[PDB]
C-alpha cells in the first residue's frame, strides 16, 4: 500500500508535506480540544475564528554551523507579531490554544548530525547573576531565535539569561530533558520533526503577554560534519500552527 515516512497536514489554508518524516508525537496523549462548559470560569461569550487564528505560520530560519549550541523559542511571543493570531491575542484579555510544532532541516546522504526538538512547559530561566532576574528583552525574542552559549555566562551584575547549554538555562541536566514530548532529527534518516502540544496550564485561561507556557528548544547533541565539496549553509526552519484557539475579554488595543 503506502509507507509511514510520508505525511501531509492541512490546517486552515496551509499545507505541510513531508516525505522522510517519523511518527507524529501527540503531547501527553491528549489532542487539543475546546474548553468544556463544566470547566470554564469566564461568564462572557468566547470568540473562535478557527481559520485565520489556526494556520501554519513560518518563522525565521537560523543557520546550523559546526559550533552552534542551540536555540529556544516562546510559542505565545513568536506569533504575537504575525497575522490575526497576533491581532487577537493583542485585543483580548484571556486566550487559550494548543500548538503544532514542525521543524525542517534537510541534508544530503553525506552529512551527519542530530538535533533534539523538545517542548518544555513552564520554562523559568535563571539569570547570570544570583541577585538580578532576566529582563523581558533578553528572555523572549519576538520572531527571533535566541541562541545559547557553549561556556558559562559572566557572573557580573547584569539582566542577561544564563545561556549555558549543558544546563538548558533552567538548571537541569540537558540529558534529562527527554521527560517532555521530544523528537530526534538525525540527518541519516529523519528530515523533519512534528509535535502536537495541548494546552498545559494550571488555569482554564491565562493572559498570553505576561505568561508564556511552552518554550520550544532545539539542541544539536551530535555536531554537524562534512567533507570539503558539500554545501556548508544548512538552515533550520520552524513552522508553528495554533489549534482550537479561543479568547475572552475584548479590551482596547494593548501592546
Amino acid at each position: 500500500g503506502y509507507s509511514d515516512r510520508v505525511r501531509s497536514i492541512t490546517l486552515g489554508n496551509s499545507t505541510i508535506t513531508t516525505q522522510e518524516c517519523a511518527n507524529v508525537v501527540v503531547g501527553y496523549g491528549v489532542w487539543p480540544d475546546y474548553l468544556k462548559d463544566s470547566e470554564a470560569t469566564a461568564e462572557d461569550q468566547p470568540t473562535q475564528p478557527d481559520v485565520a487564528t489556526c494556520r501554519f505560520y513560518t518563522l525565521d530560519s537560523v543557520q546550523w554551523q559546526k559550533t552552534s549550541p542551540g536555540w529556544w523559542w516562546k510559542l505565545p511571543d513568536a506569533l504575537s507579531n504575525l497575522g490575526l493570531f497576533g491581532q487577537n491575542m493583542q485585543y483580548h484579555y484571556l486566550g487559550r490554544t494548543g500548538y503544532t510544532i514542525h521543524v525542517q532541516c534537510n541534508a544530503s546522504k553525506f552529512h551527519q548530525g542530530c538535533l533534539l526538538v523538545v517542548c518544555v512547559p513552564e520554562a523559568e530561566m535563571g539569570c547570570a547573576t544570583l541577585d538580578n532576574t532576566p529582563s523581558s528583552a533578553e528572555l523572549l525574542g519576538g520572531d527571533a531565535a535566541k541562541e545559547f552559549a557553549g561556556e558559562p555566562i559572566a557572573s557580573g551584575s547584569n539582566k542577561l539569561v544564563q545561556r549555558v547549554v549543558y544546563n538548558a538555562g533552567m538548571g537541569i541536566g540537558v540529558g534529562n530533558l527527554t521527560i517532555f514530548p521530544h523528537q530526534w532529527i538525525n540527518l541519516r534518516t529523519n528530515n523533519s520533526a512534528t509535535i502536537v502540544m495541548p494546552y498545559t496550564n494550571s488555569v482554564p485561561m491565562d493572559n498570553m503577554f505576561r505568561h508564556n507556557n511552552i518554550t520550544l528548544m532545539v539542541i544539536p547533541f551530535v555536531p554537524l560534519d562534512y567533507c570539503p565539496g558539500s554545501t556548508t549553509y544548512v538552515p533550520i526552519t520552524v513552522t508553528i500552527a495554533p489549534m482550537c484557539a479561543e479568547y475572552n475579554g475584548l479590551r482596547l488595543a494593548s501592546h
Binding site: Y28, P121, Q162, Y166, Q183
Partner: protein, 268 residues
C-alpha cells in the same frame, strides 16, 4: 503488582524486536525474552513504595526561627513559603503542577540564656502561634490588640506535652499549586519575574504568652510540612545544580556528572 516474565524458546524469524527507530520519540518496550531465552519467573514484588503519595508523604522541616522572653526580638515573623529547605524543595520541583493538602507540626524548644540575674524561678512557658492571611493586620509589637485573633486561626501550647498539629486544605485561587511560572506580574513585562509572583500565602507569627522568669529564655520553633491526598501533573527533570536564592531559580553552572579515568574504566 509488578509484571512477570514469560518463558521463551530459540527463534529464527525475519521480524526483529531489538531493532527499532529512536528518532520517533517512542520507548521500545522489550521484554528480556526478545533478546535471549528466559524461563517463567512469577514476580510477587510490588510498586507500593513508589506511588507519589508515599514518596511525598513524609514530614520535612521547612524553616526554623528564634524569639526571646525579654529582649529586642520578643516575637517571630515568617512569610509562609517553600523553597527555603533544599530537601523538600527538590522533591516538590519534580512535578511542574502539584495539588496537595497539608499537615503542620510545630516543634517548640526553649533554652536558658546566660545572664547574671540571681534567684531564678522557672515557670511553664506558654507559646501562641498565629496565622495572618494576606491582607490582615500585623502585630507591629509583641503586645498588641492583633493578638486577640477574633477571626484568624491560632494555637496555644504549654511546654511539657505533645507538639501541636493542624490540617490545612488546598488554599489556591487556581486549580493547582504552580511550581514554575515563566512570566511577570505586570502585563508590561517589567516587574517581579518568576515563581515569586504566585506566593501570597500569608504570614505566621509566634510569641510567648507569659514571661517565664527573671532570667532571659530563648525559644526556637521549627515548622514541619506533611503533604496529604497529593496529585501531580507534568513530570519534570531533577534539579542537579545546588539552589542559591529562595525567590527564583538562579544558579551557578555545574558539570553534567562526576568524571572518571577513561572511557573503559569500571571504577569511579
Amino acid at each position: 503488582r509488578v509484571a512477570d516474565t514469560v518463558g521463551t524458546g530459540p527463534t529464527n524469524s525475519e521480524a526483529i524486536p531489538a531493532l527499532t527507530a529512536a528518532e520517533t520519540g517512542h520507548t521500545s518496550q522489550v521484554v528480556p525474552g526478545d533478546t535471549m531465552q528466559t524461563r517463567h519467573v512469577k514476580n510477587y514484588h510490588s510498586r507500593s513504595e513508589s506511588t507519589v503519595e508515599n514518596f511525598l508523604c513524609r514530614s520535612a522541616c521547612v524553616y526554623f526561627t528564634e524569639y526571646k522572653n525579654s529582649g529586642s526580638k520578643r516575637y517571630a515573623e515568617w512569610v509562609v513559603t517553600t523553597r527555603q529547605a533544599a530537601q523538600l524543595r527538590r522533591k516538590l520541583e519534580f512535578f511542574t503542577y502539584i495539588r496537595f493538602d497539608l499537615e503542620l507540626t510545630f516543634v517548640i524548644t526553649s533554652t536558658q540564656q546566660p545572664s547574671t540575674t540571681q534567684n531564678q524561678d522557672a515557670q511553664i512557658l506558654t507559646h501562641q502561634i498565629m496565622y495572618v492571611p494576606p491582607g490582615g493586620p500585623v502585630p507591629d509589637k509583641v503586645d498588641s490588640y492583633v493578638w486577640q485573633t477574633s477571626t484568624n486561626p491560632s494555637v496555644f501550647w504549654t511546654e511539657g506535652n505533645a507538639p501541636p498539629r493542624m490540617s490545612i486544605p488546598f488554599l489556591s485561587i487556581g486549580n493547582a499549586y504552580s511550581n514554575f511560572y515563566d512570566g511577570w506580574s505586570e502585563f508590561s513585562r517589567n516587574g517581579v519575574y518568576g515563581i515569586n509572583t504566585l506566593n501570597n500565602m500569608g504570614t505566621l507569627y509566634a510569641r510567648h504568652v507569659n514571661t517565664g522568669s527573671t532570667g532571659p529564655i530563648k525559644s526556637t520553633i521549627r515548622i514541619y510540612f506533611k503533604p496529604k491526598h497529593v496529585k501531580a501533573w507534568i513530570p519534570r527533570p531533577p534539579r542537579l545544580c545546588q539552589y542559591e536564592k529562595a525567590k527564583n531559580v538562579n544558579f551557578q553552572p555545574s558539570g553534567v556528572t562526576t568524571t572518571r579515568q577513561s572511557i573503559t574504566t569500571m571504577t569511579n
